[PDB]
């Protein structure tokens with residue numbers, strides 16, 4: 001019938017990729033849209049482009065943040081629409097789990113880059129204008145959000161575990177900042193956004209500080225009860 | 231009924247703004263979409279943004295070309311869709327004259343900036359990918375193109391006439407380059423583009439080297455005969 005759209009949100013290395021790759025397996029009605037940024041740091045023209053801009057961001061984030069964020073968000077919309085138009089056509093209760101959303105792109109990452117002075121006012125205002133417009137022009141509007149909530153310390157341990165060379169320099173302070181934005185947006189709900197419906201949108205919060213790779217039935221029970229109310 | 235969409239194309243200072251402001255007056259069925267870049271170098275957030283990026287382009291085109299071209303093209307699409315959805319609702323034979331198009335943005339300006347090394351390969355490929363996609367996601371597809379063809383020398387005289395301080399340093403060589411791209415795209419038709427229908431799309435070419443401010447009936451006769459065949 002009509003696909004239910006659920007964003008999975010959380011700090012770096014909270015366990016979102018682990019979680020979605022568990023969910024996709026448990027039902028034929030369940031599919032996953034991986035974060036294009038994750039696929040760039042694994043050959044498509046999008047991957048060469050993303051690979052090039054990720055690398056240039058390490059050298060000069062104040063040069064490449066605007067270019068990165070716009071291309072990261074474009075790539076997510078096109079990947080979200082491809083899944084929405086290519087899968088779960090003969091599914092009874094189809095659910096599409098997005099690894100993060102257009103809202104994390106803006107109110108977590110792009111916002112953080114503006115606050116770290118990696119975008120100037122003109123770049124941030126062009127970005128927001130582009131984002132408002134790119135999204136208007138109800139299709140990927142979310143039925144619900146699942147917040148995988150983890151302490152910065154757990155996420156720092158899990159970056160160590162994941163063992164990506166590029167990521168081993170991420171400091172606790174950076175994760176503390178991303179953590180703070182997730183708390184304000186999804187838990188305290190103190191964040192003004194420019195998308196009216198988000199304030200209604202149901203949020204399931206899951207504490208994932210404890211390892212769940214081999215012990216996730218309780219999280220899945222809460223997901224199925226969440227899905228039943230939508 | 232359904233609005234006919236005609237792009238006016240031509241080098242800087244060929245006379246496109248003069249021409250469209252003549253056409254808009256001759257019929258209630260005739261409307262004009264001015265080039266947003268033209269309105270930035272005349273307060274909306276789009277105008278502050280465009281004003282800021284135009285200024286920064288004079289200092290450092292190799293820093294701002296990507297940002298400029300993407301925002302210039304976004305702004306044109308939104309302005310084209312606003313006219314298409316707000317005017318000529320009770321017009322019998324409605325015609326909408328676009329001052330330039332999404333195709334001039336790409337195959338004239340962005341392309342020229344890439345060739346002048348103001349965009350690197352990653353910026354040019356991101357731009358083209360964005361452009362392909364932004365346009366797909368038949369609405370602003372053109373019924374025809376009117377090429378106001380003028381020599382670089384006429385355009386250089388007309389920049390002098392227009393008397394914008396910012397423009398008085400434009401050299402003949404730059405206009406010769408833009409002229410060459412217009413000839414290849416619209417006259418010789420030697421330019422491959424990534425939009426299949428453009429190769430069919432009818433082109434009216436008008437020699438506008440002679441002043442027409444007070445003597446434009448012949449040009450308008452050719453426009454009305456052109457419109458009749460579409």
Ligand SMILES: Cc1ccc(NC(=O)c2ccc(CN3CCN(C)CC3)cc2)cc1Nc1nc(-c2nc(N)cc(N)n2)cs1
Pocket residue numbers: 035037038054057058061062069072073104105106109110113116117118
């Ligand atoms: C790959 C990479 C490389 C480098 C940096 N760098 C910085 O974040 C950074 C900022 C500031 C500073 C200090 N500061 C001093 C002052 N100068 C002027 C200016 C720099 C130093 C470093 C970040 C990344 N990763 C990023 N991924 C995203 C992202 N990830 C998604 N999954 C989705 C999405 N939409 N966005 C956003 S950022």
Ligand SMILES: Cc1ccc(NC(=O)c2ccc(CN3CCN(C)CC3)cc2)cc1Nc1nc(-c2nc(N)cc(N)n2)cs1
Pocket residue numbers: 265267268284287288291292299302303334335336339340343346347348
């Ligand atoms: C306002 C402004 C300011 C500056 C420049 N500058 C250069 O074009 C320029 C390039 C190259 C050079 C030398 N080159 C040496 C080598 N370094 C590395 C790199 C620079 C020097 C200068 C152009 C403009 N105007 C522009 N308007 C458009 C445009 N106009 C529309 N109407 C629609 C649309 N889509 N685009 C495109 S460009």
Ligand SMILES: O=c1ccn([C@@H]2O[C@H](COP(=O)(O)OP(=O)(O)O)[C@@H](O)[C@H]2O)c(=O)[nH]1
Pocket residue numbers: 010011012013014015016017018019158159161162163210211212213
């Ligand atoms: O309960 C968990 C969740 C995650 N991980 C590991 O933590 C790292 C980060 O998780 P993931 O890549 O899923 O994080 P994301 O960035 O996708 O949130 C990976 O090496 C996982 O295998 C783990 O050991 N136990």
Ligand SMILES: O=c1ccn([C@@H]2O[C@H](COP(=O)(O)OP(=O)(O)O)[C@@H](O)[C@H]2O)c(=O)[nH]1
Pocket residue numbers: 240241242243244245246247248249388389391392393440441442443
């Ligand atoms: O037949 C003409 C056409 C144009 N102009 C002048 O040439 C300049 C450039 O024309 P316009 O601004 O229309 O050029 P565009 O950039 O819009 O092609 C302006 O000062 C016009 O008044 C003119 O004197 N005679």
Ligand code: NA
Pocket residue numbers: 023024025026027028029030031
């Ligand atoms: Na599945």
Ligand code: NA
Pocket residue numbers: 253254255256257258259260261
């Ligand atoms: Na009119």
